[PDB]
Amino acid sequence: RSDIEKLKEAIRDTNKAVQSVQSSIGNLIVAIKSVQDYVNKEIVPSI
Amino acid sequence: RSDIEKLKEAIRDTNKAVQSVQSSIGNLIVAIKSVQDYVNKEIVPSIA
Amino acid sequence: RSDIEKLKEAIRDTNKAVQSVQSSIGNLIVAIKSVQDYVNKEIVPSIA
Amino acid sequence: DXIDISIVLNKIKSQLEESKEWIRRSNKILDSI
Amino acid sequence: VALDXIDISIVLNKIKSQLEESKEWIRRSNKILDSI
Amino acid sequence: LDXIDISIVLNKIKSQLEESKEWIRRSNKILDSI
């Protein structure tokens, strides 16, 4: 209940928000790499 | 002026930075989806 | 050492974590642009 | 879909919503100071 | 023929501007911390 | 074997993502010491 404890918990929640963002970026890599792979495997041979 | 008030506002600014990053990632989804849609609409019907 | 000094350094490290995320998003833009440019330059002329 | 990235994009949106709520909880705590 | 089949310039520019707003907030945070 | 070759940039993103994770770990470790 102390102000120090509250600031501590606030930072903890901020860090969890950053961890969620970190997970979202990891999946963004997957999304972009999936687009890359489809183009290279299914489209590029046609041209 | 207190170190407690300094810490509090520092976290609020950091939180604002995270929110801007959240908006950036939402727009990265749109950019990727735009590439996906063009490929499926304009290119795929000719090769598959 | 002090609790205030610990809180400060904790926020400092969180800010550096955000800065790394910021750099990663700048490179995600590079990746998307590379896919976009290849499709536009090497594939689009064939289908449109 | 040709390219189907619906699963991964849906996961990204879901993780962003969780991120937004952690920031909401953080500001809510700072408000009690 | 015309530059950019796929044109995502506007959204990519928005992402860049939001990233710069984010960098600005981190500066404002580090500024405060340096005074502690 | 990758027309489009973004392996270099995708690995750089992973590297920067790893650094972000380490900074968060350090932050939580400092908080845990309180």
Short mmCIF file of C-alpha atoms in Angstrom, two decimals:
data_model
loop_
_atom_site.label_atom_id
_atom_site.label_comp_id
_atom_site.label_asym_id
_atom_site.label_seq_id
_atom_site.Cartn_x
_atom_site.Cartn_y
_atom_site.Cartn_z
CA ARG A 1 0.00 0.00 0.00
CA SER A 2 3.07 2.23 0.21
CA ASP A 3 3.84 4.60 -2.66
CA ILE A 4 7.05 2.65 -3.30
CA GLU A 5 5.04 -0.57 -3.55
CA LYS A 6 2.60 1.07 -5.98
CA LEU A 7 5.36 2.35 -8.27
CA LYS A 8 6.88 -1.14 -8.13
CA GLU A 9 3.62 -2.74 -9.27
CA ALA A 10 3.11 -0.08 -11.95
CA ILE A 11 6.49 -0.93 -13.50
CA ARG A 12 5.65 -4.63 -13.27
CA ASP A 13 2.50 -4.06 -15.34
CA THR A 14 4.43 -1.88 -17.80
CA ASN A 15 6.95 -4.71 -18.22
CA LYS A 16 4.13 -7.17 -18.90
CA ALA A 17 2.78 -4.81 -21.58
CA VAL A 18 6.22 -4.83 -23.20
CA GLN A 19 6.39 -8.63 -23.02
CA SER A 20 3.06 -8.85 -24.86
CA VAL A 21 4.47 -6.49 -27.51
CA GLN A 22 7.54 -8.73 -27.73
CA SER A 23 5.29 -11.72 -28.45
CA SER A 24 3.38 -9.76 -31.09
CA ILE A 25 6.62 -8.93 -32.91
CA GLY A 26 7.67 -12.58 -32.85
CA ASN A 27 4.43 -13.45 -34.62
CA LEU A 28 4.90 -10.56 -37.06
CA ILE A 29 8.12 -12.28 -38.14
CA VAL A 30 6.09 -15.44 -38.78
CA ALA A 31 3.49 -13.53 -40.80
CA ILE A 32 6.09 -11.79 -42.97
CA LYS A 33 8.09 -14.98 -43.46
CA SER A 34 4.93 -16.83 -44.51
CA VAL A 35 4.30 -14.23 -47.23
CA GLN A 36 7.93 -14.50 -48.35
CA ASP A 37 7.82 -18.29 -48.51
CA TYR A 38 4.58 -18.44 -50.51
CA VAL A 39 5.92 -15.97 -53.08
CA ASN A 40 9.19 -17.89 -53.46
CA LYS A 41 7.61 -21.35 -53.61
CA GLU A 42 4.32 -20.80 -55.46
CA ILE A 43 4.75 -17.60 -57.52
CA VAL A 44 8.42 -17.10 -58.39
CA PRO A 45 8.67 -20.39 -60.39
CA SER A 46 5.84 -19.17 -62.64
CA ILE A 47 7.95 -16.14 -63.57
CA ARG B 1 9.40 17.83 -7.28
CA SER B 2 9.69 14.79 -5.03
CA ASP B 3 11.55 11.72 -6.24
CA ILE B 4 8.23 9.88 -5.87
CA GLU B 5 6.55 12.30 -8.27
CA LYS B 6 9.55 12.08 -10.60
CA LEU B 7 9.23 8.29 -10.74
CA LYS B 8 5.46 8.43 -11.30
CA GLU B 9 5.63 10.79 -14.28
CA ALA B 10 8.59 8.84 -15.69
CA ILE B 11 6.42 5.71 -15.78
CA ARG B 12 3.53 7.61 -17.35
CA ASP B 13 5.85 8.77 -20.14
CA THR B 14 7.17 5.22 -20.58
CA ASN B 15 3.56 3.99 -20.77
CA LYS B 16 2.88 6.57 -23.49
CA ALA B 17 5.87 5.20 -25.42
CA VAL B 18 4.44 1.68 -25.19
CA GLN B 19 1.05 2.87 -26.44
CA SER B 20 2.67 4.50 -29.48
CA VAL B 21 4.45 1.20 -30.16
CA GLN B 22 1.13 -0.64 -29.85
CA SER B 23 -0.35 1.65 -32.51
CA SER B 24 2.69 1.07 -34.72
CA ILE B 25 2.22 -2.71 -34.61
CA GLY B 26 -1.47 -2.38 -35.43
CA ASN B 27 -0.46 -0.49 -38.57
CA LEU B 28 2.18 -3.11 -39.40
CA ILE B 29 -0.70 -5.61 -39.49
CA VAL B 30 -2.47 -3.39 -42.03
CA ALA B 31 0.65 -3.10 -44.19
CA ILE B 32 1.20 -6.87 -44.23
CA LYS B 33 -2.49 -7.48 -44.93
CA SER B 34 -2.29 -5.04 -47.85
CA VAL B 35 0.54 -7.06 -49.39
CA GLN B 36 -1.39 -10.28 -48.75
CA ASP B 37 -4.56 -8.92 -50.35
CA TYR B 38 -2.83 -7.65 -53.50
CA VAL B 39 -1.10 -11.01 -54.03
CA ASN B 40 -4.28 -13.03 -53.56
CA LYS B 41 -6.37 -10.67 -55.71
CA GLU B 42 -4.06 -9.69 -58.57
CA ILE B 43 -1.37 -12.40 -58.84
CA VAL B 44 -2.74 -15.71 -57.52
CA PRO B 45 -5.57 -16.08 -60.10
CA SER B 46 -2.92 -16.26 -62.85
CA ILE B 47 -0.54 -18.86 -61.38
CA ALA B 48 -2.86 -21.02 -59.23
CA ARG C 1 21.13 0.74 -3.36
CA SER C 2 18.10 2.64 -2.09
CA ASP C 3 14.58 1.63 -3.10
CA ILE C 4 14.21 4.86 -5.10
CA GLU C 5 17.50 4.11 -6.86
CA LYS C 6 16.25 0.60 -7.62
CA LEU C 7 12.97 1.92 -9.05
CA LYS C 8 14.93 4.38 -11.21
CA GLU C 9 17.20 1.69 -12.65
CA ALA C 10 14.23 -0.62 -13.22
CA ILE C 11 12.53 2.05 -15.34
CA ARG C 12 15.85 2.71 -17.09
CA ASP C 13 16.01 -0.95 -18.15
CA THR C 14 12.35 -0.94 -19.21
CA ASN C 15 13.05 2.13 -21.36
CA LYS C 16 15.95 0.29 -23.01
CA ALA C 17 13.64 -2.66 -23.65
CA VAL C 18 11.25 -0.28 -25.42
CA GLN C 19 14.11 1.18 -27.47
CA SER C 20 15.02 -2.31 -28.70
CA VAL C 21 11.39 -2.89 -29.67
CA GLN C 22 11.48 0.44 -31.52
CA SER C 23 14.55 -0.63 -33.50
CA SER C 24 12.92 -3.98 -34.30
CA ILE C 25 9.86 -2.22 -35.73
CA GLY C 26 12.08 -0.08 -37.94
CA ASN C 27 13.55 -3.29 -39.34
CA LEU C 28 10.10 -4.86 -39.77
CA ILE C 29 9.42 -1.90 -42.09
CA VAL C 30 12.55 -2.88 -44.01
CA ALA C 31 11.37 -6.49 -44.33
CA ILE C 32 7.89 -5.53 -45.56
CA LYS C 33 9.35 -3.03 -48.03
CA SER C 34 11.69 -5.69 -49.43
CA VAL C 35 8.75 -8.03 -50.07
CA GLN C 36 6.73 -5.15 -51.54
CA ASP C 37 9.57 -4.03 -53.82
CA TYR C 38 10.27 -7.53 -55.15
CA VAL C 39 6.60 -8.15 -55.96
CA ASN C 40 6.26 -4.73 -57.62
CA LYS C 41 9.48 -4.95 -59.64
CA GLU C 42 9.80 -8.66 -60.45
CA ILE C 43 6.25 -10.11 -60.43
CA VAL C 44 3.72 -7.33 -61.12
CA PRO C 45 5.00 -6.57 -64.66
CA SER C 46 4.12 -10.17 -65.57
CA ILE C 47 0.46 -10.11 -64.47
CA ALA C 48 -0.49 -6.45 -65.05
CA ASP D 1 -6.96 -17.88 -48.69
CA UNK D 2 -3.37 -18.19 -51.76
CA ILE D 3 -1.70 -16.63 -48.68
CA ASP D 4 -3.56 -17.26 -45.40
CA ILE D 5 -2.07 -15.63 -42.31
CA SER D 6 -5.36 -15.30 -40.43
CA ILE D 7 -4.24 -17.42 -37.46
CA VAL D 8 -1.07 -15.42 -36.84
CA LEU D 9 -2.61 -11.99 -37.44
CA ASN D 10 -5.45 -12.82 -35.04
CA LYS D 11 -2.89 -13.83 -32.41
CA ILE D 12 -1.07 -10.51 -32.89
CA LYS D 13 -4.25 -8.48 -32.39
CA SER D 14 -5.08 -10.52 -29.28
CA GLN D 15 -1.62 -9.92 -27.81
CA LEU D 16 -1.88 -6.18 -28.50
CA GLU D 17 -5.17 -6.06 -26.58
CA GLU D 18 -3.47 -7.78 -23.64
CA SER D 19 -0.64 -5.25 -23.89
CA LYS D 20 -3.11 -2.35 -23.89
CA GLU D 21 -4.78 -3.69 -20.75
CA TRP D 22 -1.49 -4.06 -18.86
CA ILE D 23 -0.83 -0.38 -19.57
CA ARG D 24 -4.35 0.38 -18.35
CA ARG D 25 -3.62 -1.47 -15.10
CA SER D 26 -0.32 0.40 -14.76
CA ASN D 27 -1.88 3.85 -15.15
CA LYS D 28 -4.67 2.79 -12.78
CA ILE D 29 -2.05 2.06 -10.12
CA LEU D 30 -0.27 5.38 -10.69
CA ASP D 31 -3.64 7.13 -10.30
CA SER D 32 -3.82 5.84 -6.71
CA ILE D 33 -0.66 7.81 -5.85
CA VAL E 1 4.22 0.61 -65.35
CA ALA E 2 3.26 3.08 -62.61
CA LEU E 3 5.52 3.11 -59.56
CA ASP E 4 4.44 0.98 -56.60
CA UNK E 5 1.34 -2.37 -57.91
CA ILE E 6 1.48 -2.33 -54.08
CA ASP E 7 1.44 1.16 -52.53
CA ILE E 8 1.78 1.13 -48.73
CA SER E 9 3.68 4.41 -48.48
CA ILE E 10 1.05 6.11 -46.30
CA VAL E 11 0.79 3.32 -43.73
CA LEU E 12 4.57 2.93 -43.58
CA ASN E 13 4.88 6.69 -43.01
CA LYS E 14 2.30 6.44 -40.21
CA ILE E 15 4.31 3.64 -38.58
CA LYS E 16 7.43 5.80 -38.76
CA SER E 17 5.67 8.79 -37.19
CA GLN E 18 4.25 6.67 -34.37
CA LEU E 19 7.72 5.21 -33.75
CA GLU E 20 9.08 8.76 -33.47
CA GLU E 21 6.35 9.72 -31.00
CA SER E 22 7.39 6.64 -29.01
CA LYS E 23 11.03 7.73 -29.09
CA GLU E 24 9.95 11.17 -27.87
CA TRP E 25 8.17 9.74 -24.83
CA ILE E 26 11.22 7.64 -23.92
CA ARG E 27 13.37 10.79 -24.10
CA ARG E 28 10.96 12.53 -21.72
CA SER E 29 11.20 9.55 -19.36
CA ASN E 30 15.01 9.29 -19.44
CA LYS E 31 15.20 13.07 -18.92
CA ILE E 32 13.32 12.75 -15.62
CA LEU E 33 15.30 9.71 -14.45
CA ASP E 34 18.64 11.43 -15.11
CA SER E 35 17.58 14.05 -12.54
CA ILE E 36 17.35 11.37 -9.82
CA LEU F 1 16.13 -20.99 -51.83
CA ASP F 2 14.57 -17.58 -51.18
CA UNK F 3 13.75 -14.91 -54.99
CA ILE F 4 12.90 -12.82 -51.88
CA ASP F 5 15.73 -13.04 -49.31
CA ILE F 6 14.97 -11.22 -46.06
CA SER F 7 16.83 -13.69 -43.82
CA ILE F 8 19.37 -11.04 -42.78
CA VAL F 9 16.80 -8.48 -41.60
CA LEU F 10 14.56 -11.09 -39.95
CA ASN F 11 17.54 -12.30 -37.91
CA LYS F 12 18.40 -8.72 -36.95
CA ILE F 13 14.84 -8.29 -35.66
CA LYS F 14 15.21 -11.47 -33.60
CA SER F 15 18.50 -10.19 -32.19
CA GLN F 16 16.94 -6.86 -31.20
CA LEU F 17 13.95 -8.75 -29.80
CA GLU F 18 16.31 -10.83 -27.65
CA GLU F 19 17.94 -7.66 -26.31
CA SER F 20 14.52 -6.27 -25.37
CA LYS F 21 13.73 -9.47 -23.48
CA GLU F 22 16.99 -9.24 -21.53
CA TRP F 23 16.31 -5.63 -20.55
CA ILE F 24 12.88 -6.65 -19.22
CA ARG F 25 14.45 -9.53 -17.29
CA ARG F 26 16.90 -7.10 -15.70
CA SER F 27 14.08 -4.69 -14.85
CA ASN F 28 12.03 -7.40 -13.12
CA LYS F 29 15.14 -8.67 -11.31
CA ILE F 30 15.75 -5.19 -9.87
CA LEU F 31 12.10 -4.94 -8.83
CA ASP F 32 12.32 -8.37 -7.19
CA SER F 33 15.18 -7.06 -5.02
CA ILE F 34 12.79 -4.51 -3.49
#
